[PDB]
């Protein structure tokens, strides 16, 4: 049970709890509910690598207090 930051589209970080044995979509769902934004409207990267829905969180080299970046899908 790791604590991390997800930096939002405004450049501001928010603390999320995460399990390395769980897939990336678990964190998508946490961000989606807390920041009021549909899952298919954003993606996450970590150290410049895109995170993928069915990849385990532990495969990305996550650490306590590390930062994931949220990327809005921009459409207009």
């Amino acid at each position: 049970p790791l604590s991390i930051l997800v930096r939002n589209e405004r450049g501001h970080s928010n603390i999320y709890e995460v399990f390395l044995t769980q897939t990336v979509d678990t964190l998508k769902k946490k961000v989606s509910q807390r920041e009021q934004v549909h899952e298919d409207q954003f993606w996450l990267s970590f150290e410049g690598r895109p995170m993928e829905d069915k990849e385990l969180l532990g495969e990305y080299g996550l650490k306590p207090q590390c930062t994931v970046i949220k990327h809005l899908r921009l459409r207009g």
Partner: protein, 159 residues
């Protein structure tokens, strides 16, 4: 102009770099408002690619997408990030009025060898961030204004 070219962008991923800053939009650019027909993204590229300043190539710019997909979609962080299906995406993206933005900026910046910057504006019309797709400076870039997270207008850099 002078100021915008002094911005050091932060590299993030692929050819995407980013800036956090507040600007008065009208002080730095003139805006040509685009119509609400689903095509603003491609209208703005058409308008910005040429001094005659017309959006009537918008269909042509849209028709670049299948070819850019062949070249790049397999490697676009956003497509990968969102787990998009290639064939699903290409079929929708070519339809009249289908919205576009960050993914097509990423593909086309590369495909045409240009720099596209989407400047993000809050409720009050203040630029609050920007995404730059490419390595060029803003004075040379295709500058777009993103409004209400649902529309783009074209920006002409002011002098």
């Amino acid at each position: 102009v002078n100021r915008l070219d002094a911005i050091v962008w932060e590299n993030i991923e692929g050819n995407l770099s980013r800036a956090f800053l507040t600007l008065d939009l009208h002080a730095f650019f003139n805006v040509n408002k685009e119509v609400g027909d689903g095509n603003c993204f491609y209208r703005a590229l058409s308008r910005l690619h040429s001094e005659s300043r017309t959006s009537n190539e918008h269909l042509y710019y849209r028709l670049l997408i299948p070819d850019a997909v062949d070249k790049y979609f397999d490697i676009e962080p956003e497509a990968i990030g969102l787990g998009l299906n290639k064939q699903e995406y290409v079929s929708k993206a070519i339809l009249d009025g289908e919205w576009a933005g960050s993914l097509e900026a990423s593909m086309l910046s590369k495909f045409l060898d240009i720099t596209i910057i989407i400047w993000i504006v809050d409720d009050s019309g203040t630029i609050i961030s920007a995404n730059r797709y490419g390595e060029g400076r803003p004075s040379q870039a295709y500058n777009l204004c993103m409004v209400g997270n649902a529309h783009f207008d074209s920006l002409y850099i002011r002098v």
